[PDB]
Amino acid sequence: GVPTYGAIILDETLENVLLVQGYLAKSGWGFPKGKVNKEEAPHDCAAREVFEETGFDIKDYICKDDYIELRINDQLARLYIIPGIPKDTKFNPKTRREIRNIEWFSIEKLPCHRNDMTPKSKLGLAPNKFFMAIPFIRPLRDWLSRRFG
Ligand SMILES: CC(=O)Nc1cccc(NC(N)=O)c1
């Protein structure tokens, strides 16, 4: 798959993260991110996708070594960590045929896994609107503990 880049934006307290809600297949909440263009650098792709989805320019805040990267089904997603963005920032997508809403979420309240259906003796996982964010939540909490404590 084509690599994706974007950002985990935190507020000044480090207890809230900025998620975006798409439509259709991307109907749930997830971090702002998207697919790299041919010949586009990782930092430039992250900033472009975040600016398209939130209207906030991370370019001057990106740190090269500060990111979480996961390989999911043989597609690589790298989110640059961007702390200290004030919660009263005005976020507006460029692309409202693509983004329904933009909200801050408490990191401690977000799930880091889906719930099974063991009460129903059925296999699989129950739907969760944070599906696209979930894989990054534990690595993020671990990264924030290492970096700040
Ligand atoms: C394209 C990309 O960034 N990969 C990604 C990111 C978050 C969650 C999932 N989860 C899944 N599709 O199963 C995949």
Swiss-Prot record:
S-S pairs: none
PTM note: Phosphorylated at ser-249 in a MTOR-dependent manner.
Outcome of mutating E53Q: Strongly reduced decapping activity
Superkingdom of this protein's organism: Eukaryota
Localization per record: Cytoplasm, P-body; Nucleus
Motif (Nudix box) on chain: 34-55
Protein name from the UniProt record: m7GpppN-mRNA hydrolase
Organism: Homo sapiens (Human)
Portion held of the full protein: 96 to 244 of 420
